[PDB]
Scaffold this active site. Sequence first.
Site, mmCIF file in Angstrom:
data_model
loop_
_atom_site.group_PDB
_atom_site.id
_atom_site.type_symbol
_atom_site.label_atom_id
_atom_site.label_comp_id
_atom_site.label_asym_id
_atom_site.label_seq_id
_atom_site.Cartn_x
_atom_site.Cartn_y
_atom_site.Cartn_z
ATOM 1 N N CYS B 46 -8.227 4.085 1.315
ATOM 2 C CA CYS B 46 -6.859 3.593 1.303
ATOM 3 C C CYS B 46 -6.532 3.036 -0.079
ATOM 4 C CB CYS B 46 -6.681 2.522 2.382
ATOM 5 S SG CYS B 46 -5.113 1.607 2.373
ATOM 6 N N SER B 48 -5.164 0.372 -0.823
ATOM 7 C CA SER B 48 -5.494 -1.048 -0.920
ATOM 8 C C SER B 48 -6.923 -1.268 -1.401
ATOM 9 C CB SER B 48 -5.280 -1.738 0.426
ATOM 10 O OG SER B 48 -3.924 -1.655 0.833
ATOM 11 N N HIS B 51 -6.689 -0.973 -5.014
ATOM 12 C CA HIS B 51 -6.079 -2.176 -5.577
ATOM 13 C C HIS B 51 -7.121 -3.232 -5.916
ATOM 14 C CE1 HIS B 51 -2.195 -0.603 -5.101
ATOM 15 N NE2 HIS B 51 -1.849 -1.127 -3.938
ATOM 16 N N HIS B 67 -11.951 -0.875 4.654
ATOM 17 C CA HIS B 67 -11.355 -1.577 5.787
ATOM 18 C C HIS B 67 -10.752 -0.618 6.810
ATOM 19 C CE1 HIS B 67 -8.266 -0.785 2.839
ATOM 20 N NE2 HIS B 67 -7.415 -0.757 3.846
ATOM 21 N N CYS B 174 -6.122 1.670 9.662
ATOM 22 C CA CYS B 174 -5.145 1.197 8.688
ATOM 23 C C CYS B 174 -3.949 2.112 8.472
ATOM 24 C CB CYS B 174 -5.784 0.941 7.323
ATOM 25 S SG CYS B 174 -4.568 0.174 6.202
HETATM 26 N N1 LIG Z 1 1.412 -3.652 4.561
HETATM 27 C C1 LIG Z 1 0.127 -3.155 5.007
HETATM 28 O O1 LIG Z 1 -0.415 -3.535 5.993
HETATM 29 C C2 LIG Z 1 -0.570 -2.097 4.181
HETATM 30 C C3 LIG Z 1 -0.100 -1.824 2.774
HETATM 31 N N2 LIG Z 1 -0.608 -0.692 2.030
HETATM 32 C C4 LIG Z 1 -0.102 -0.438 0.711
HETATM 33 O O2 LIG Z 1 0.946 0.761 0.884
HETATM 34 C C5 LIG Z 1 0.992 1.388 -0.280
HETATM 35 C C6 LIG Z 1 0.742 2.910 -0.082
HETATM 36 O O3 LIG Z 1 -0.577 3.105 0.349
HETATM 37 P P1 LIG Z 1 -1.150 4.629 0.334
HETATM 38 O O4 LIG Z 1 -0.224 5.543 1.082
HETATM 39 O O5 LIG Z 1 -2.569 4.579 0.818
HETATM 40 O O6 LIG Z 1 -1.126 4.905 -1.275
HETATM 41 P P2 LIG Z 1 -0.865 6.294 -2.088
HETATM 42 O O7 LIG Z 1 -1.290 6.005 -3.506
HETATM 43 O O8 LIG Z 1 -1.635 7.428 -1.459
HETATM 44 O O9 LIG Z 1 0.726 6.664 -2.040
HETATM 45 C C7 LIG Z 1 1.581 6.019 -2.941
HETATM 46 C C8 LIG Z 1 2.668 7.033 -3.357
HETATM 47 O O10 LIG Z 1 3.539 6.411 -4.116
HETATM 48 C C9 LIG Z 1 3.931 7.438 -5.272
HETATM 49 N N3 LIG Z 1 4.533 6.680 -6.346
HETATM 50 C C10 LIG Z 1 3.887 5.955 -7.265
HETATM 51 N N4 LIG Z 1 4.803 5.399 -8.078
HETATM 52 C C11 LIG Z 1 6.015 5.784 -7.654
HETATM 53 C C12 LIG Z 1 7.285 5.514 -8.111
HETATM 54 N N5 LIG Z 1 7.715 4.704 -9.236
HETATM 55 N N6 LIG Z 1 8.334 6.027 -7.492
HETATM 56 C C13 LIG Z 1 8.166 6.822 -6.406
HETATM 57 N N7 LIG Z 1 6.914 7.087 -5.949
HETATM 58 C C14 LIG Z 1 5.849 6.562 -6.578
HETATM 59 C C15 LIG Z 1 2.778 8.004 -5.581
HETATM 60 O O11 LIG Z 1 2.991 9.344 -6.201
HETATM 61 C C16 LIG Z 1 2.030 8.138 -4.235
HETATM 62 O O12 LIG Z 1 2.191 9.366 -3.657
HETATM 63 C C17 LIG Z 1 -0.105 0.754 -1.163
HETATM 64 O O13 LIG Z 1 0.440 -0.183 -2.009
HETATM 65 C C18 LIG Z 1 -0.995 0.059 -0.123
HETATM 66 O O14 LIG Z 1 -1.818 -0.994 -0.782
HETATM 67 C C19 LIG Z 1 -1.559 0.211 2.644
HETATM 68 C C20 LIG Z 1 -1.994 -0.004 4.085
HETATM 69 C C21 LIG Z 1 -1.701 -1.306 4.816
HETATM 70 O O1 LIG Z 2 -4.485 -1.734 3.467
HETATM 71 C C1 LIG Z 2 -4.964 -2.646 4.143
HETATM 72 N N1 LIG Z 2 -4.639 -3.935 4.054
HETATM 73 C C2 LIG Z 2 -3.683 -4.471 3.085
HETATM 74 C C3 LIG Z 2 -2.535 -5.159 3.805
HETATM 75 C C4 LIG Z 2 -1.540 -5.737 2.802
HETATM 76 C C5 LIG Z 2 -2.225 -6.695 1.849
HETATM 77 C C6 LIG Z 2 -3.377 -6.016 1.137
HETATM 78 C C7 LIG Z 2 -4.374 -5.432 2.134
HETATM 79 ZN ZN LIG Z 3 -5.367 0.102 4.089
#
Ligand SMILES: NC(=O)C1=CN([C@@H]2O[C@H](COP(=O)(O)OP(=O)(O)OC[C@H]3O[C@@H](n4cnc5c(N)ncnc54)[C@H](O)[C@@H]3O)[C@@H](O)[C@H]2O)C=CC1
Ligand SMILES: O=CNC1CCCCC1
Ligand SMILES: [Zn+2]
Lengths: 374, 374
Positions: B46, B48, B51, B67, B174
Amino acid sequence: STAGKVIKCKAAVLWEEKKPFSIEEVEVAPPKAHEVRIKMVATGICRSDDHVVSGTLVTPLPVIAGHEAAGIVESIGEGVTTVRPGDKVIPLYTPQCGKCRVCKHPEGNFCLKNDLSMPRGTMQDGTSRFTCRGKPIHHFLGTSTFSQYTVVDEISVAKIDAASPLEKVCLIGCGFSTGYGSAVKVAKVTQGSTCAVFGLGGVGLSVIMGCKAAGAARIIGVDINKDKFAKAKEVGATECVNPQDYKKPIQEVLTEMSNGGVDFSFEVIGRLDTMVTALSCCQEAYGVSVIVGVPPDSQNLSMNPMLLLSGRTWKGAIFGGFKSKDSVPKLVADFMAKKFALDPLITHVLPFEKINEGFDLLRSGESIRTILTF
Amino acid sequence: STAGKVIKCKAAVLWEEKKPFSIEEVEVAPPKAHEVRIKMVATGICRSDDHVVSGTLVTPLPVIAGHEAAGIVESIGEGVTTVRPGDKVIPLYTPQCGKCRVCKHPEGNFCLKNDLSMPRGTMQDGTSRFTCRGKPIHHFLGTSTFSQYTVVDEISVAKIDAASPLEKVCLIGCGFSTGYGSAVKVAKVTQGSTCAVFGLGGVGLSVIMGCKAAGAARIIGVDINKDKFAKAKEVGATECVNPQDYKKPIQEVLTEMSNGGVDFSFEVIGRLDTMVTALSCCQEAYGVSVIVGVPPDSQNLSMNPMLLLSGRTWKGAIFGGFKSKDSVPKLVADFMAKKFALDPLITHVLPFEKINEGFDLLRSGESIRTILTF
Ligand SMILES: NC(=O)C1=CN([C@@H]2O[C@H](COP(=O)(O)OP(=O)(O)OC[C@H]3O[C@@H](n4cnc5c(N)ncnc54)[C@H](O)[C@@H]3O)[C@@H](O)[C@H]2O)C=CC1
Ligand SMILES: O=CNC1CCCCC1
Ligand SMILES: [Zn+2]
Ligand SMILES: NC(=O)C1=CN([C@@H]2O[C@H](COP(=O)(O)OP(=O)(O)OC[C@H]3O[C@@H](n4cnc5c(N)ncnc54)[C@H](O)[C@@H]3O)[C@@H](O)[C@H]2O)C=CC1
Ligand SMILES: O=CNC1CCCCC1
Ligand SMILES: [Zn+2]
Ligand SMILES: [Zn+2]
Ligand SMILES: [Zn+2]
């Protein structure tokens, strides 16, 4: 006798920012098609009118301000179907055109015909009905109630009960409905919850009334003017706190008092910092914060989005979220049936000619609502 | 042959930021009271987790990250009642203690026992079960799945269907649940609505899946990597736009395409500018915007509060708003009943020993989810 003719009357003209209003003669044109000319009876002094004077709220000058009012229809233009001469009416600073996508949406009320987002200071047709010293004068939010007569578009006026006391129900034109609706319609305060209300003026007192009507168990009033606390408790607050009394930021104080954050918070002042403070003091996983106060023109706040990622909801609303023409007559009917009170908001009464003393009272902190009588 | 004994096994240790993971032998202590030791079967990569490597997300180092996973219980500590050795389980990076005010609230899911708000990188008792080369190693969000064995607190694990395909349902730990729930539970997307999804990785594609399941009429995908568009349309996007293709800001483009703003927008990237853009592109009077992406540590965004005063709702959520231990077994059962699809998210399947190659695939833009198999 006046129908179809220009009316010369007195109005409070604002010629420039940070100056007293000028009580002087204006010329009020007769209403065109789908317009309504109203003889004003009473108008309240709302902080948003003072925001025009101070430059906090930008709208073209010179202007006839005023937007919280009630009056009696003097004449109607061609095609008007919803009011008649002699009807008691409340002008609507948020129109209800009934045709746009917002008016058709079950929740939305910020009609796309509004003059707030991109202010012109005109009628819907882009022109003005006011002249002063031979000079055209702008309208304000399509209402301009600081005048013995005004002209409003039909989508900006609601007919109300013929027996309504206009010196009281003018507050349904803004302050009461905004605060009450922000609690019961926008936030949807739940029975048994804990609420925090930042700002205990006319609008904040009305938020408290709505929280109490919704059955909140605790309602914490927040104001830096402790003279506001007595009335807040009268209308439903269970405690009041002055941020100046504490060595900690008040969001920390409120989080401790609520054993982890409040269910619902309301910013009803108009400051960027209290907007962020109010969001922070609601519970991080399920709290809701509603912005009601008007921010200074074109200024951005700064905030950490982790406040939202944990689960908080942040929203704002105009006029308590009420669809204006649908809701104003129903609110008047509810007031007539004693479902809520307006006298707690009215602290001062003055003739229209003493409008500047009314604004002095607001700025000094002494008043809640001053009602002006024409 | 391992119950009650220290286990020596392979894990991926992150010794410091901006370095490859180090694949080496660690020691995993036996579970204490109310703890569960799990043999990992599959874990997803993931963003995250990345990150943590990049410093976007701050948590104590050195650490065993990971996770998003599924495995089989090897042993349980005294007092454990909800899982048994041999059970298939999914670790929960958001716990569900069942006892705090958030767990008892019908909407909240950000249990106060979480290790996100004030990251310690330990078990609930404040200590670590991991040793490497002599040294204690930190946990990550109470899970730490980049290891052949981990130990979690009972409130951070859910028992799932014994017939579950763990190389697929690890994503319910997740990425899928976060995106799907952000649409169907947090935003509550409505039938016939127009949605905008910023970011088309694993989580953004799951947001699209949820929008489609809720009956959205239009789902606009937004990504600067046009290579993501094909899969986005396969899972339900009706249109895709690349901001780099336009001379105007994309919030203006999306407002035009939606004839005045979208009903629901989602930020699923983790950038301050795109969280403000996503809020702005939803309709000013009734639109809803959900933040899903993780912002860079300690950075504030800047926005104009008139975006909210007109009527917008802004919210965020962890793990799609799902109460974790309640929801994960039901989501697994729903998958087994074929109510949603996980294969569209899985682009690569690699042995655990290739973890760094899997992270290279994510960073290069080529992968959605790589599943690592133990
Ligand atoms: N709130 C929560 O519980 C969770 C939050 N997250 C967060 O969600 C976000 C996405 O996670 P994933 O799908 O695994 O990541 P990912 O990296 O696979 O997808 C992110 C997408 O955003 C695109 N992107 C990057 N910069 C951009 C921009 N300026 N404009 C438009 N598109 C852009 C990328 O090309 C990429 O396809 C991450 O920040 C992650 O840490 C992930 C899972 C749980
Ligand atoms: O992607 C999994 N967990 C994330 C949820 C949002 C804060 C950072 C960790
Ligand atoms: Zn996650
Ligand atoms: N969203 C909407 O539709 C509406 C918005 N408004 C705005 O709501 C706000 C309140 O309006 P009124 O009640 O008429 O104004 P008001 O001036 O009577 O009340 C404001 C209260 O806030 C207190 N206050 C000022 N600074 C404070 C601070 N730092 N911390 C705590 N308290 C502080 C003041 O002492 C005062 O009692 C104004 O900004 C007004 O423009 C008013 C009506 C409609
Ligand atoms: O007080 C009445 N109207 C206000 C509503 C919020 C924006 C400024 C004008
Ligand atoms: Zn007002
Ligand atoms: Zn309308
Ligand atoms: Zn809990």
